[PDB]
Amino acid sequence: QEPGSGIGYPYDNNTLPYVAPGPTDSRAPCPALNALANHGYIPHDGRAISRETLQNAFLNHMGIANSVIELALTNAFVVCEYVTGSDCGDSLVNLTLLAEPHAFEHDHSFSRKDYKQGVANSNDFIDNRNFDAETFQTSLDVVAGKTHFDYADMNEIRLQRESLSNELDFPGWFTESKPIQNVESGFIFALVSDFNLPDNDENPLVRIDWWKYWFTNESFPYHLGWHPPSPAREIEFVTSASSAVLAASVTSTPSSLPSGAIGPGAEAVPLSFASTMTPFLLATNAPYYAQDPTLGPND
Ligand code: HEM
Ligand SMILES: *[C@@H]1O[C@H](CO)[C@@H](O[C@@H]2O[C@H](CO)[C@@H](O[C@@H]3O[C@H](CO)[C@@H](O)[C@H](O)[C@@H]3O)[C@H](O)[C@H]2NC(C)=O)[C@H](O)[C@H]1NC(C)=O
Ligand SMILES: *[C@@H]1O[C@H](CO)[C@@H](O[C@@H]2O[C@H](CO)[C@@H](O)[C@H](O)[C@H]2NC(C)=O)[C@H](O)[C@H]1NC(C)=O
Ligand SMILES: *[C@H]1O[C@H](CO)[C@@H](O)[C@H](O)[C@@H]1O[C@H]1O[C@H](CO)[C@@H](O)[C@H](O)[C@@H]1O
Ligand SMILES: *[C@@H]1O[C@H](CO)[C@@H](O)[C@H](O)[C@H]1NC(C)=O
Ligand SMILES: *[C@H]1O[C@H](CO)[C@@H](O)[C@H](O)[C@@H]1O
Ligand SMILES: *[C@H]1O[C@H](CO)[C@@H](O)[C@H](O)[C@@H]1O
Ligand SMILES: *[C@H]1O[C@H](CO)[C@@H](O)[C@H](O)[C@@H]1O
Ligand SMILES: *[C@H]1O[C@H](CO)[C@@H](O)[C@H](O)[C@@H]1O
Ligand SMILES: *[C@H]1O[C@H](CO)[C@@H](O)[C@H](O)[C@@H]1O
Ligand SMILES: *[C@H]1O[C@H](CO)[C@@H](O)[C@H](O)[C@@H]1O
Ligand SMILES: *[C@H]1O[C@H](CO)[C@@H](O)[C@H](O)[C@@H]1O
Ligand SMILES: *[C@H]1O[C@H](CO)[C@@H](O)[C@H](O)[C@@H]1O
Ligand SMILES: *[C@H]1O[C@H](CO)[C@@H](O)[C@H](O)[C@@H]1O
Ligand SMILES: [Br-]
Ligand SMILES: [Br-]
Ligand SMILES: [Br-]
Ligand SMILES: [Mn+2]
Numbered sequence: 001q002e003p004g005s006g007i008g009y010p011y012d013n014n015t016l017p018y019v020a021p022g023p024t025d026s027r028a029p030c031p032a033l034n035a036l037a038n039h040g041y042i043p044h045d046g047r048a049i050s051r052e053t054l055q056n057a058f059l060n061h062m063g064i065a066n067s068v069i070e071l072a073l074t075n076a077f078v079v080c081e082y083v084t085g086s087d088c089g090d091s092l093v094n095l096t097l098l099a100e101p102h103a104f105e106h107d108h109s110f111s112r113k114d115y116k117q118g119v120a121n122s123n124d125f126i127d128n129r130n131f132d133a134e135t136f137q138t139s140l141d142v143v144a145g146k147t148h149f150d151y152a153d154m155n156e157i158r159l160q161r162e163s164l165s166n167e168l169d170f171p172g173w174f175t176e177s178k179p180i181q182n183v184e185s186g187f188i189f190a191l192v193s194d195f196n197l198p199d200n201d202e203n204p205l206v207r208i209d210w211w212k213y214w215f216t217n218e219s220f221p222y223h224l225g226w227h228p229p230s231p232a233r234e235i236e237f238v239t240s241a242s243s244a245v246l247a248a249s250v251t252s253t254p255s256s257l258p259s260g261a262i263g264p265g266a267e268a269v270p271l272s273f274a275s276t277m278t279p280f281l282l283a284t285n286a287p288y289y290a291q292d293p294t295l296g297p298n299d
Contacts, residue, residue, distance in 0.1 A: 001015045001016075001018070001222065001297065001298040001299075002015070002017050002297055002298055003015055005298055007222045007298060008061075008222065008227070008228070011063070011227040011228045011230055012060065012061055012227070012228055014060070015039070015061070016039045016040045016041065017039070017297030018038050018039060018219045018295050018297055018298070018299055019038060019039075019040065019044060019297070020038070020289040020290075020294065021034075021037070021038065021044070021046070021288075021289055023286045023287075024045070025037075025044065025046055025287050026045060026046030026047055026094035026095045026096045026287070027046055027095055027096065027130070027287035027288065028046070028095035028096065028098045028099065028129070029098055029099040029105045029109070029112055029128065029129045029130075030098065031131070031214055031215045031218055032058075032062065032064075032187070032191070033046075033095055033098070034095075034131075034218040034287075035062075035214065035218045035219055035220060036054075036057045036058070036062070037095065038218055038219055039061065039219070041056075041057035041060075041061045042054060042057045046094055046095035046096065046287075047093065047094045047095075048091045048092070048093070049091065049092040049095070050090050050091060050092070051073050051077075051090055054069065054073060054092075059232055061228065062191065062220075062228050063191075063227075063228030063229035063230055063231075063232045063233060064190065064191070064228075064229075064232060064233055065231075065233060065234045065235075067235035067236075068187075068190065068233060068234060068235050068238055070235065071183075071268060071269075071270065072104075074270050075104045075270060075271050076098060077092065078104075078270065078271045078272065078273070079097060079098060079100050079271065080092055080093055080097060082100065082103065082273040082277075082279055083097040083100050083279045083282070084097065096129065096282060097282060099128055099129035099282060099283060100279055100280060100282060101114075101115035101125075101128055101280050102175055102280070103271060103273070103279075104180065105128060105129070106175070106177035106180050106181060107165050107169065107173070107174055107175050107176070107177060108158070108161040108162045108164075108165040108166075108174075108176070108177065108181065109128070109135070109161070109181075110135075110136065110139045110157065110158075110161060110184075110188075110215075111132060111135055111136035111139065111215050112127075112128055112129065112130070112131070112132055112135060113126055113127065113128055113132050113135050114126075114128055114165050114168070114169050114173065114174070115128040115173070115280070115283075116169050116173040117165065117168050117169050117170075118168050118169075118170075119170050122170060122172075124170075125281065125283065126283065127283045127285045128283060129282075129283050129285065130285055130287065130288035131215060131216065131218065131288045133216070136212075136215055138161065138164055139157050139160070139161060140208070140212065141160075142156050142157045143157065143208060146208060147207065147208055147209070148194060148205040148206060148207055148208065149205060149206050149208065150203075150206075150248075151189075151241070151244040151245050151247075151248045152248035152249060152250075152251070154185050154188070154189075154206070154245045154248075155245045155246065155248040155250060156250065156251075156252060158178075158181060158182065158185060158245070159250065159253070159254055159257065159261060159262070160254055162176060162254075162257055162258065162261055163254035163255060163256045163257055164254075166257065166258055167256045174258070176258045176260075176261065178246065178261075178265035178266070179265050179266045179268040179269070180268055182242040182245055182246055182265050183238060183239070183242055183268045185241065185245045186238035186239060186240070186241035186242040186245070187238060188206055188211060189204045189206060189237075189238075189241040190229065190233040190237055190241065191214065191229070191233070192206055192207055192210040192211045192214060192221075192226065193205055193206050193207070194206070194207045194210075195229060196225070201237070204241065207224075207226075209224050210224055210226050213226075216290060217290045217295055217299065218288075218289070218290065219290075219295055219299055223299070239267075242265070243264070246263065246264050246265045247264065250262050
């Protein structure tokens with residue numbers, strides 16, 4: 001928000017306003033990076049981004065400590081080298097390359113379509129990067145009529161997304177990605193669980209309106225009482241939440257789940273790509289921004 005507005009105070013004492021991305025700006029498949037870039041906490045054009053810029057942006061503006069993004073930084077740079085064909089040093093070329101499929105970006109996302117979702121021909125691909133309202137609605141519908149949800153609910157959401165994706169994706173495309181997805185499940189708990197409840201740290205419940213605002217608007221739900229977690233969330237919280245989601249008993253089982261969907265997931269690890277492997281072409285769509293309504297500088 002506008003620095004003088006004091007909307008972030010006393011959690012964030014140095015805010016910057018929301019500015020919609022323009023057609024030439026680079027955006028990510030990540031709702032967090034996109035929100036940061038929309039505020040200029042990382043470059044508004046989404047290009048030439050250092051590790052420290054990301055670290056400071058997450059820590060100072062979203063209450064996410066360095067430990068939370070350690071692997072994510074490593075993997076961002078692995079993907080940058082893979083896509084561009086050379087080492088990216090400490091300047092991530094852009095955000096858009098992070099939507100390279102079957103890499104850091106993955107199938108069965110909560111709010112994005114898959115790279116080959118619903119395509120008639122094997123060579124076709126679609127926008128697996130920008131926010132997709134319909135896809136996100138398939139996630140929200142699992143918790144329809146509710147204001148909050150718990151670990152077991154999140155487990156049901158990711159299962160619904162896996163089932164839909166396995167059914168809709170071009171045959172042979174679908175590839176399950178429980179370890180990366182469920183770090184992101186833990187990220188959702190870390191950012192938008194309800195810290196106003198007494199047992200938040202031990203038993204976090206996602207506030208659905210906060211989650212919807214963040215994902216749909218790619219800006220921060222201050223108007224709904226949200227603020228950056230204080231103290232900043234650490235990696236322990238995230239991976240514990242990840243484990244808890246996958247540990248939670250399944251009471252409704254969708255059909256067409258891939259093998260071993262239900263049960264513990266592997267620890268997320270650094271990505272690696274063979275030098276002989278050429279990257280898949282990136283979707284070229286202009287960056288998404290909220291238009292129903294469009295957002296003001298304080299939104
Ligand atoms: C340098 C740090 C980060 C990088 C490079 C990064 C990268 C990515 C990428 C490539 C995806 C796409 C995966 C897919 O859904 O197919 C993604 C998704 C996601 N990211 Fe980030 N991320 C970072 C930090 C964070 C943080 C700190 C949060 C919140 C605390 C966050 C929240 C999410 C969520 C919730 C998704 C899933 C979106 C969906 O499934 O629709 N990210 N991220
Ligand atoms: C973010 O950065 C990525 C990585 O550099 C950009 O994707 C790449 O964009 C270039 C164009 O600048 C594409 O190069 C073209 O490739 C075709 C076919 O290989 C060739 O005939 C053209 O002469 C040109 O070299 C490249 O394919 C593409 N990489 C991938 C894997 O899709 C991306 O455009 C950047 N996005 C933004 C919004 O900045
Ligand atoms: C995206 O942000 C906009 C702007 O903050 C939200 O619009 C507001 O919605 C609330 C209800 O929750 C109203 O009190 C305000 O009057 C709205 N303002 C405008 C301009 O409409 C919008 O709800 C957010 N989107 C989501 C899905 O959370
Ligand atoms: C992205 O741009 C490419 C050309 O630069 C197209 O060939 C791709 O099909 C893809 O097109 C989509 O996104 C662009 C934004 O650059 C739109 O202009 C198109 O209408 C399309 O949605
Ligand atoms: C914001 O400023 C107030 C008043 O000086 C201070 O008490 C608070 O610690 C600051 N918040 C942060 C995150 O530094
Ligand atoms: C989240 O983190 C837990 C613990 O590392 C994993 O089991 C899960 O698969 C996801 O990566
Ligand atoms: C989540 O999982 C990691 C291992 O993946 C632990 O290091 C952490 O303490 C938390 O349980
Ligand atoms: C790891 O940490 C999470 C979040 O604090 C808990 O919910 C979980 O039970 C485990 O202790
Ligand atoms: C990972 O961690 C979670 C939360 O502590 C457990 O519920 C799960 O069984 C696994 O050990
Ligand atoms: C975990 O527990 C639930 C009940 O909470 C069962 O429905 C499920 O089959 C699993 O054993
Ligand atoms: C078991 O409980 C889950 C949520 O924990 C529901 O989504 C499901 O329909 C069943 O009642
Ligand atoms: C739905 O069905 C699966 C397997 O049939 C169970 O693992 C799950 O607990 C739920 O009952
Ligand atoms: C229980 O919930 C699952 C996952 O959301 C559905 O696939 C199933 O139809 C039932 O409603
Ligand atoms: C987004 O842009 C629209 C213009 O259509 C305004 O009406 C709105 O206030 C917001 O700034
Ligand atoms: Br670029
Ligand atoms: Br489809
Ligand atoms: Br796994
Ligand atoms: Mn995806």
